[PDB]
Design an enzyme around this catalytic site. Structure first.
Site, PDB file in Angstrom:
ATOM      1  N   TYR A 139       0.816  -1.203   0.000  1.00 37.45           N
ATOM      2  CA  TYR A 139       0.000   0.000   0.000  1.00 37.45           C
ATOM      3  C   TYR A 139       0.858   1.265   0.000  1.00 37.45           C
ATOM      4  O   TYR A 139       2.082   1.233   0.158  1.00 37.45           O
ATOM      5  CB  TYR A 139      -0.945   0.009   1.207  1.00 37.45           C
ATOM      6  CG  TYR A 139      -0.274   0.268   2.546  1.00 37.45           C
ATOM      7  CD1 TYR A 139       0.407  -0.746   3.212  1.00 37.45           C
ATOM      8  CD2 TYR A 139      -0.319   1.527   3.140  1.00 37.45           C
ATOM      9  CE1 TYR A 139       1.021  -0.514   4.432  1.00 37.45           C
ATOM     10  CE2 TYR A 139       0.290   1.765   4.350  1.00 37.45           C
ATOM     11  CZ  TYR A 139       0.961   0.746   4.992  1.00 37.45           C
ATOM     12  OH  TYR A 139       1.564   0.999   6.203  1.00 37.45           O
ATOM     13  N   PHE A 181      -6.164   5.361   0.878  1.00 40.40           N
ATOM     14  CA  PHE A 181      -5.212   4.272   0.703  1.00 40.40           C
ATOM     15  C   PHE A 181      -5.266   3.758  -0.727  1.00 40.40           C
ATOM     16  O   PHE A 181      -6.352   3.508  -1.260  1.00 40.40           O
ATOM     17  CB  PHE A 181      -5.498   3.122   1.676  1.00 40.40           C
ATOM     18  CG  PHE A 181      -5.178   3.441   3.106  1.00 40.40           C
ATOM     19  CD1 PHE A 181      -3.864   3.497   3.534  1.00 40.40           C
ATOM     20  CD2 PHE A 181      -6.192   3.666   4.027  1.00 40.40           C
ATOM     21  CE1 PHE A 181      -3.558   3.792   4.844  1.00 40.40           C
ATOM     22  CE2 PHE A 181      -5.894   3.956   5.345  1.00 40.40           C
ATOM     23  CZ  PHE A 181      -4.574   4.016   5.754  1.00 40.40           C
ATOM     24  N   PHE A 196       1.382  10.219   4.196  1.00 42.96           N
ATOM     25  CA  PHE A 196       1.807   9.928   5.556  1.00 42.96           C
ATOM     26  C   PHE A 196       2.435   8.554   5.712  1.00 42.96           C
ATOM     27  O   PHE A 196       3.166   8.336   6.684  1.00 42.96           O
ATOM     28  CB  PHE A 196       0.628  10.061   6.538  1.00 42.96           C
ATOM     29  CG  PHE A 196      -0.342   8.902   6.504  1.00 42.96           C
ATOM     30  CD1 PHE A 196      -1.246   8.769   5.460  1.00 42.96           C
ATOM     31  CD2 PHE A 196      -0.357   7.955   7.523  1.00 42.96           C
ATOM     32  CE1 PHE A 196      -2.141   7.714   5.427  1.00 42.96           C
ATOM     33  CE2 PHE A 196      -1.248   6.893   7.489  1.00 42.96           C
ATOM     34  CZ  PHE A 196      -2.139   6.775   6.439  1.00 42.96           C
ATOM     35  N   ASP A 197       2.183   7.633   4.787  1.00 45.08           N
ATOM     36  CA  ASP A 197       2.754   6.298   4.838  1.00 45.08           C
ATOM     37  C   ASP A 197       2.953   5.833   3.404  1.00 45.08           C
ATOM     38  O   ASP A 197       2.211   6.231   2.502  1.00 45.08           O
ATOM     39  CB  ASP A 197       1.838   5.336   5.624  1.00 45.08           C
ATOM     40  CG  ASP A 197       2.448   3.933   5.849  1.00 45.08           C
ATOM     41  OD1 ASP A 197       2.318   3.427   6.977  1.00 45.08           O
ATOM     42  OD2 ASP A 197       2.997   3.284   4.932  1.00 45.08           O
ATOM     43  N   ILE A 253      -6.328  -1.434  11.138  1.00 44.92           N
ATOM     44  CA  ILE A 253      -7.553  -0.710  11.473  1.00 44.92           C
ATOM     45  C   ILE A 253      -8.751  -1.329  10.754  1.00 44.92           C
ATOM     46  O   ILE A 253      -8.614  -2.129   9.819  1.00 44.92           O
ATOM     47  CB  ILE A 253      -7.408   0.780  11.129  1.00 44.92           C
ATOM     48  CG1 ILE A 253      -6.912   0.937   9.688  1.00 44.92           C
ATOM     49  CG2 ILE A 253      -6.475   1.463  12.115  1.00 44.92           C
ATOM     50  CD1 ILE A 253      -6.591   2.361   9.283  1.00 44.92           C
ATOM     51  N   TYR A 261      -9.211   5.964  13.470  1.00 45.79           N
ATOM     52  CA  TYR A 261      -8.649   7.011  14.328  1.00 45.79           C
ATOM     53  C   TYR A 261      -9.588   8.203  14.501  1.00 45.79           C
ATOM     54  O   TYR A 261      -9.296   9.304  14.024  1.00 45.79           O
ATOM     55  CB  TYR A 261      -7.286   7.475  13.798  1.00 45.79           C
ATOM     56  CG  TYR A 261      -6.316   6.351  13.509  1.00 45.79           C
ATOM     57  CD1 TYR A 261      -5.692   6.240  12.269  1.00 45.79           C
ATOM     58  CD2 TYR A 261      -5.997   5.418  14.489  1.00 45.79           C
ATOM     59  CE1 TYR A 261      -4.793   5.213  12.009  1.00 45.79           C
ATOM     60  CE2 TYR A 261      -5.102   4.393  14.241  1.00 45.79           C
ATOM     61  CZ  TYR A 261      -4.503   4.296  13.002  1.00 45.79           C
ATOM     62  OH  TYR A 261      -3.613   3.273  12.762  1.00 45.79           O
TER      63      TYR A 261
END
Lengths: 319, 771, 107, 273, 48, 139
Positions: C26, C99, C36-37, C56, C82
């Site tokens: 991903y 994502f 962010f990732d 999650i 979150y």
């Protein structure tokens, strides 16, 4: 419990190995002697010449001089200064019916090793760090004052005048008050901890396979014997060449604002030493013979009493 | 805009470099939870690409190498550098075939070889930002980075940097020679001290340092370097000398296990010959002093004395001197550059003959490096008492101990908070059931375990903020001083601080002060008077002012502190009474100190009768309004203070053989204590009738327990004694027959408490006065 | 609510079941466009077990609807991933997560 | 000097000055035998610093009752503005730290000298005096509008005095920890005036020199002090000294504070703007 | 009111006094016994 | 102290403790201290347990259990240390040792005993029995 002591072949191998590393250390490595102190100092001293910049031995002593004059309440213990001070001490301890030519060639050799150290400014380096010690008798004054004697050994004159002008252009009080605080915190023959030592010496072996570490506690009475002779030998050799301006300076410091007068505190310590050996005599006045413990402590007290006797006569041998 | 345009911008160059130092200083000093959260901003692909990019500016390149070691390679680097000082080698067969010189007296390459010293792993954890967040977190590890590709890259940019330094270009990497060599060297230094580099890789670093000496292009030391590059190379060569020292300690321990397997086989063979030896009688015990009578430490000291009374034959005494001349030839001693010590020594002086060093960090690091090379045998002897040897069946729990001790030393560098306290409790709570703490007591003392617990007690004691933390630490030092006696002696040096902060619930540092002087006559007789005047001044404080904890809780007002001063009185029974025999020096100085201050005694003896105070003590204990209105009661603490006061005056009394002599000191002390406390007051107290438990149970913290009468009969037996018969049958009638028929009727906690009272205190008295 | 919008087609017959591993390469983003990732800057594919509550809730209800070799784009609402306190230092509170998941092998 | 052992006494009263730790001095007719006081001279660098303490205190007590003359009375005794400015300009040049290119044997003697005379200045006033002339001057936040209570000349010189008042406060707590320990109780006096927009370089250097010398201020900081510093950075441009005070807020004396290290990570970082 | 204190106060500036003679000329001469003079504090600006 | 025991009782005692521990905390109840001693052969009656908890709340931790076995083993070993210490004195082993044999083997044992201390030792007490030698050693 001596008789139920286990042998080695019934002991396990890992605890038998740790008793081997400690025994091989104390019997072979501590007893081995090496003379690396001379060869390191001569190669840094011949390092002054190469193909007015400071020499590597000169670089080291100003590095030791700059870490003394930083403002701090106490001085940190530096293993590197203790390790370099006794190298410079044993570098000059080599020369310290015989004929005339050989004794002066031993003397001009010794003033050469003292010339190799003190023209780099080591004479002020030792006085800065007694000044910055401020009355703490740690392990570091044993290292700098044994260096202070080996530079001043034999009644050398250019090392003393380099010390005297330095305390006169600075006019900073704190070198003379430190000798005063170092003088009153010296031990004498006590008669309170002596029976504590006599009672604890009767335990020859502690139970459960333990040898008593006699070197850890040592001698409780006059444990500070070496340094209070090492301090008074430094004060004797300061006025060994009959230099008159030192015994007027140590008596009354007219340049500084507060006079200390070490010579009175010399008599104050020896009067303290007189009443301790006299009371040590009155404790042994009823017994017939003296054991090996008492003649150990009495020759310990009489040898420092002779050093302060030698410290006092050289103060007054000059006119 | 491109990151390479900041070399001409010179404003956002300054901002991003100041932002990057904030990226280093926030996630510093072992804070891994933010160091994962910072890994989202700076990616690992953009950070490894910035390592080999030569068009990056000066301070921006230097901060990126410092950033990656700050987020990945510092929590594991600090733990192993703290573990590199102590040497724990097990007796595995990998150790038993190790020599100082490689076979093929030519010294091998430093850092190349086999080592067996136990060091904990780095415990890496992979970063992930999509996992489910729980809910206190137990612990969070340093973020994992692939070190197999980072090590080959680190050797490549260093391999290009030393080769590009020989051409002397006008525009180096970063804009100067300092920014080219310093960030690559400090990164090569930190992955080398963590210990990922293979043996072939460290042969290549030494060929890049000096290709002439280390061969099994121009070198890095012959090149002219500025003072920042010189400082990072001293940290690189401090590693190789520590590895040369560690190889020398492991070879000395490998020789020791190869020697004592032959040593215990020889001596038992000499004992089997001695038990079949009937040809001598006076010399038969002279051969048997070492075998059965001498302690096993004194056997090794006596058997290894064959230099310059040793029953070892000529077969097994030359192999150690063959090892001894092999070890000094490994050091700088000739015992009659091409080596590491000759290379470093000529390099430090050539760096010193170049120009005046104005940086004090380098010149001390230069002379500390030069002193380590010439004084090689002195460096080994100062490092060998921190070198231990364990059995190979204990490695599964010893590295579990060093992972948990490394937890505490990584917690020492950060200030304590609400969550790092409970990690300290679980850590010390795991050291006390790791089973290595108990079988080898001399290794916990060598690791600095007791020092790591006391500096956390220094920082917290300085009111107290974490009471759960300070009790578990002093409980750890109380049980540490009872595993072996030399563990107690290292604690006796700390008593001036351990008794200064004694004056809360649970354990208190006075219990460490009490455990440091218990059941050992050596530390008791060597105790100074200066630690004893602090206890009696703390006890003189409890007589005028009351407890701050009691009057704030709601207790009635009483003018003195019974429960506080009882903690100082039971401390002083341990100093004046050791192994059932009272010392004379400590008892003389504690009685001399207590009688000048009348406030250290109770207010009754300072004047009401002592029975009249204890009869008033029953009056407040029986009444619920006069008592405390929760576990501390006033009526029990007053007699608990007095019984601690009375038996202290009993155990400091001289024995009978000092009264039998002509010592004017012993009858003087007995004249003070007999005239301090009267006799017939104690005859009444020992005769006091108590509530017998029969058909219901009383409370022990709210009634009279027979431990107070055991204090009164011991003081009566020691300072007074029984000499005649009218005194004998009177206290025996009126004092013990209401006690003993009460125990005969209970044939219950009071039944077991008074039964221990009879067979410990009165029945040794009756057998003393049996004729 | 998980909005699964496809990007590249896949097999369409192999779907993940319970108790089975998946590897997903991903790269996550926020609604504003800030990444962010990513799991491709590390060159190490993310592997997770479905149903054991590792990832999650929006990620596994997102990975269960895809096929082998399919690459889709999710928009996870802040209620499912979150919500209140968030993850400190990475994602701000009450932020929408995007994502770009791609299932490489093994369902 | 010290060899006389002589007492002080009046010429007409004829009374001995003896005692009664803090023993009050009284002229007693009985006298005592312990009144033989010996005179010791002071040094020359202390006598000069003590008089300019009095020369500044005589001006600035007059500056405060001059400024409080019109504190509560609107304007529809002339204050010495030209005297208040040059006296600060010599006081900053008096406390200016030595150069870094100087000899270390001379740098240490001037640094230890400077610390005793900033400790001697603060003990007899010269700090609580400095905060009160600032807290009376900050209430007029505008330079010419709200400063009409004094005049036109004091309004045009309103800006210059607080620049010299804060540069001296940045000079007085620079390096010495004993004066940096006075600012533990009034941290919010420094923090709430960061976005005042009047000498904003002045307060920031004051907060910078007080957070690098004393570690007792770093553990009394909650999140509202931190949010004002990001609010300082977000309205006064991309500054690099605002980053250095945040670098000085994480660790102290080699010891990290995680009460302050996480609040920067959850406020400055996840916004990413 | 005038007090007494220890050595920490003695190095501070509150314990400094300055002596002035009565007559104008030759103020810097050496003081002798039987000489009237005044006591001045250098910080508070007050006369004892 | 706790150095009176070898490694191998301590590794056996942690083997018994961790076998019947509750959750790995190092905790047992006031029942489990009884079953952990009867698992190793030692069978005390309940008075022997009754004093040791009063000696040490209901939570018996592993250093508390290790100190209670150390006192439970040292008292019988300190009562029996002195007979095997008497065995090298006599050649047969019944307890009868010569007076001429005792002045070279007792002056040479390694506690630095001179000729004067063993001369004081035997004339503050032919061949003497074994139970008198405990009577003359402990005094």
């Amino acid at each position: 419990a001596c008789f139920r002591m286990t042998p080695l072949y019934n002991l396990p191998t890992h605890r038998a190995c740790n008793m081997f590393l400690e025994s091989y250390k104390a019997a072979w490595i501590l007893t081995e002697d090496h003379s690396f102190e001379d060869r390191m100092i001569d190669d840094l001293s011949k390092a002054g010449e190469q193909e007015k910049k400071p020499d590597p031995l000169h670089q080291l002593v100003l590095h030791f001089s700059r870490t003394a004059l930083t403002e701090k309440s106490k001085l940190d213990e530096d293993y590197l200064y203790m390790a370099y001070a006794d190298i410079m001490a044993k570098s000059c301890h080599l020369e310290e019916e015989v004929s005339f030519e050989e004794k002066e060639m031993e003397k001009q050799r010794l003033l050469y090793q003292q010339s190799r150290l003190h023209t780099r400014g080591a004479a002020e380096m030792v006085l800065q760090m007694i000044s910055a010690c401020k009355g703490e008798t740690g392990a570091m004054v044993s290292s700098t004052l044994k260096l202070g004697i080996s530079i001043l050994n034999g009644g050398n004159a250019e090392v003393q005048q380099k010390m005297l002008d330095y305390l006169k252009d600075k006019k900073e009080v704190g070198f003379f008050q430190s000798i005063q605080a170092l003088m009153q915190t010296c031990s004498v023959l006590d008669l309170n901890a002596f029976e504590r030592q006599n009672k604890a010496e009767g335990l020859g072996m502690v139970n459960e396979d333990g040898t008593v570490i006699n070197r850890q506690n040592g001698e409780k009475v006059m444990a500070d014997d070496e340094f209070t002779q090492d301090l008074f030998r430094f004060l004797q050799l300061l006025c060994e060449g009959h230099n008159n301006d030192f015994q007027n300076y140590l008596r009354t410091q007219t340049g500084n604002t507060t006079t200390i007068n070490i010579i009175i505190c010399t008599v104050d310590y020896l009067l303290r030493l007189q009443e301790s050996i006299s009371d040590f005599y009155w404790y042994y006045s009823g017994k017939d013979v003296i054991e090996e413990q008492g003649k150990r402590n009495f020759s310990k007290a009489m040898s420092v009493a002779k050093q302060v006797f030698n410290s006092l006569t050289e103060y007054i041998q000059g006119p | 805009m491109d990151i390479l345009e900041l070399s001409e911008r010179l404003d956002l160059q300054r901002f991003h470099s100041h932002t990057l130092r904030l990226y280093r200083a926030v996630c510093a000093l072992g804070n891994n939870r933010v160091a994962h959260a910072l890994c989202s901003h700076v990616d690992q692909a953009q950070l490894l690409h910035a390592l080999e990019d030569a068009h990056l500016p000066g301070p921006l390149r230097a901060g990126y190498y410092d950033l990656l070691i700050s987020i990945h390679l510092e929590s594991a680097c600090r733990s192993r550098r703290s573990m590199l000082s102590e040497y724990i080698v097990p007796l595995t067969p990998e150790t038993r075939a190790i020599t100082l010189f490689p076979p093929g007296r030519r010294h091998g390459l430093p850092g190349v070889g086999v080592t067996t010293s136990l060091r904990p792993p780095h415990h890496f954890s992979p970063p992930c930002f999509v996992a489910a967040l729980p809910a206190e977190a137990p612990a969070r590890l340093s973020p994992a980075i692939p070190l197999e590709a980072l090590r080959d890259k680190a050797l490549r940019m260093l391999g290009e940097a030393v080769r590009d330094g020989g051409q002397h270009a006008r525009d180096p990497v970063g804009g100067s020679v300092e920014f080219q060599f310093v960030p690559v060297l400090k990164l090569v230094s930190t992955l080398l001290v963590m210990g990922i580099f293979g043996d072939e890789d460290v042969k290549q670093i030494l060929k890049m340092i000096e290709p002439e000496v280390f061969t099994e292009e121009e070198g890095l030391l012959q090149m002219k370097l500025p003072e920042s590059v010189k400082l990072q190379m001293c940290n690189l060569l401090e590693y190789f000398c520590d590895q040369e020292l560690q190889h020398r300690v492991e070879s000395l321990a490998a020789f020791a296990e190869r020697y004592v397997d032959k040593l215990q086989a020889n001596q038992r063979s000499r004992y089997a010959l001695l038990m079949r030896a009937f040809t001598m009688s006076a010399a038969e015990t002279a051969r048997r002093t070492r075998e059965f009578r001498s302690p096993p430490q004194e056997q090794i000291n006596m058997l290894l004395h064959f230099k310059d009374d040793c029953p070892l034959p000529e077969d097994i005494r030359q192999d150690l001197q063959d090892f001894h001349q092999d070890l000094l030839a490994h050091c700088g001693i000739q015992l009659e550059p091409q080596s590491l010590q000759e290379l470093v020594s000529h390099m430090v002086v050539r760096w010193a003959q170049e120009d005046y060093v104005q940086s004090p960090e380098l010149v001390r690091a230069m002379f500390s490096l030069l002193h380590r090379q010439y004084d090689g045998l002195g460096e080994l002897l100062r490092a060998l008492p921190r070198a231990y040897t364990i059995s190979p069946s204990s490695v599964e729990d010893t590295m579990s101990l060093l992972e948990c001790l490394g937890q505490i030393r990584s917690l020492l560098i950060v200030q304590m908070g609400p969550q790092e306290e409970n990690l300290m409790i679980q850590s010390i709570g795991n050291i006390m059931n790791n089973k290595v703490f108990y079988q080898h007591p001399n290794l916990m003392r060598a690791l600095g375990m007791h020092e790591t617990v006391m500096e956390v007690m220094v920082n917290v004691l300085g009111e107290i903020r974490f009471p759960k933390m300070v009790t578990s630490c002093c409980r750890f030092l109380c049980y540490f001083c009872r595993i072996s006696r030399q563990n107690q002696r290292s604690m006796f040096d700390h008593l001036s601080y351990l008794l200064e902060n004694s004056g809360m619930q649970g354990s208190t540092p006075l219990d460490v002060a009490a455990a440091s002087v218990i059941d050992n006559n050596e530390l008791a007789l060597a105790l100074q008077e200066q630690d004893l005047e602090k206890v009696v001044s703390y006890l003189a404080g409890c007589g005028l002012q009351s407890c701050p904890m009691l009057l704030a809780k709601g207790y009635p007002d009483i003018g003195w502190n019974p429960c506080g001063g009882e903690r100082y009185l039971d401390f002083l029974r341990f100093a004046v009474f050791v192994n059932g025999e009272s010392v004379e020096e400590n008892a003389n100085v504690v009685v001399r100190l207590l009688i000048r201050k009348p406030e250290c005694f109770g207010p009754a003896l300072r004047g009401s009768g002592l029975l009249a105070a204890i009869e008033e003590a029953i009056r407040i204990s029986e009444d619920p309004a006069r008592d405390g209105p929760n576990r501390v009661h006033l009526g029990h603490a007053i007699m608990s203070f007095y019984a601690a006061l009375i038996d202290l005056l009993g155990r400091c009394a001289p024995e009978m053989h000092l009264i039998q002599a002509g010592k004017g000191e012993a009858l003087r002390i007995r004249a003070i204590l007999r005239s301090l406390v009267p006799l017939d007051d104690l005859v009444g107290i020992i005769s006091l009738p108590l509530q017998i438990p029969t058909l219901v149970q009383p409370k022990m913290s709210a009634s009279f327990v027979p431990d107070h009468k055991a204090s009164m009969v011991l003081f009566l037996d020691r300072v007074y004694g029984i000499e005649n018969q009218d005194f004998l049958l009177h206290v025996l009638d009126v004092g013990f027959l209401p006690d003993m028929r009460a125990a005969a009727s209970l044939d219950t906690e009071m039944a077991l408490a008074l039964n221990r009272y009879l067979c410990l205190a009165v029945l040794p008295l009756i057998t003393k006065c049996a004729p | 609510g998980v909005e699964i919008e496809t990007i590249s087609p896949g097999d369409g017959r192999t779907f993940p079941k319970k108790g089975q591993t998946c590897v997903v390469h991903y790269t996550g983003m926020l609604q504003n466009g800030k990444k962010f990732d990513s799991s491709r800057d590390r060159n190490k594919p993310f592997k997770f077990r479905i149903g054991k509550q590792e990832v999650i809730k929006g990620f596994e209800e997102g990975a269960a609807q895809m096929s082998l070799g399919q690459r889709a784009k999710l928009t996870c609402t802040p209620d499912v991933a979150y919500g209140a306190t968030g993850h400190p230092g990475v994602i701000p509170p009450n932020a929408t997560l995007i994502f770009d998941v791609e299932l490489l092998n093994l369902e | 000097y010290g060899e006389s052992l002589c007492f002080v006494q009046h010429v007409a009263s004829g009374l001995w000055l003896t005692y009664a730790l803090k023993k009050k001095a009284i002229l007693h007719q009985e006298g005592h035998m312990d009144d033989a006081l010996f005179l010791t001279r002071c040094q020359q660098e202390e006598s000069q610093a003590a008089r300019m303490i009095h020369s500044t205190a005589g001006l600035y007590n007059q500056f405060i009752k001059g400024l409080d003359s019109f504190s509560g009375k609107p304007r529809g005794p002339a204050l010495p503005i030209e005297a208040v400015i040059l006296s600060l300009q010599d006081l900053i040049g008096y406390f200016e730290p030595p150069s870094e290119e100087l000899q270390h044997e001379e740098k240490q003697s001037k640094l230890r000298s400077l610390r005793n005379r900033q400790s001697l200045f603060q003990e007899e006033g010269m700090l609580s005096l400095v905060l009160n002339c600032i807290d009376r001057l900050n209430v007029y936040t505008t330079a010419a509008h709200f400063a009409e209570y004094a005049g036109e000349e004091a309004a045009e010189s309103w800006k210059e005095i607080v620049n010299l008042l804060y540069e001296l406060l940045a000079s007085l707590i620079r390096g010495n920890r004993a004066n940096c320990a006075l600012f533990s109780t009034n941290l919010d006096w420094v923090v709430s005036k960061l976005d005042r927009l009047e000498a904003s370089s002045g307060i920031l250097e004051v907060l910078y020199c007080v957070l690098i010398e004393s570690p007792e201020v770093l553990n009394i900081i909650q999140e509202n002090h931190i949010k004002s510093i990001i609010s300082l950075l977000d309205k006064h441009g991309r500054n690099h000294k605002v980053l250095d005070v945040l670098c000085s807020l994480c660790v102290c004396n080699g010891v990290a504070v995680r009460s302050n290290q996480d609040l920067i990570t959850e406020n400055l970082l996840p916004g990413r703007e | 009111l005038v007090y007494y204190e220890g050595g920490a106060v003695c190095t501070h500036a509150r314990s400094l006094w300055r002596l002035e003679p009565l007559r104008i000329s030759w103020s810097g001469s050496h003081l002798r016994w039987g000489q009237p003079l005044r006591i001045r504090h250098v910080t508070t600006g007050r006369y004892l | 102290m706790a150095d009176q025991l070898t490694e191998e009782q301590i590794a056996e005692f942690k083997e018994a403790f961790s076998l019947f521990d509750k959750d790995g905390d190092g905790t047992i109840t006031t029942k489990a201290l009884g079953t952990v001693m009867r698992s190793l052969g030692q069978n005390p009656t309940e008075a022997e347990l009754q004093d040791m908890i009063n000696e040490v709340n209901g939570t018996i931790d592993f250093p508390a259990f290790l100190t209670m076995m150390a006192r439970k083993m040292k008292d019988t070993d300190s009562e029996e240390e002195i007979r095997e210490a008497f065995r090298v004195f006599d050649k047969d082993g019944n307890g009868y040792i010569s007076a001429a044999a005792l002045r070279h083997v007792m002056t040479n044992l390694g506690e630095k005993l001179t000729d004067e201390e063993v001369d004081e030792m035997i004339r503050e007490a032919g061949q003497v029995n074994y139970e008198a030698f405990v009577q003359m050693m402990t005094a």
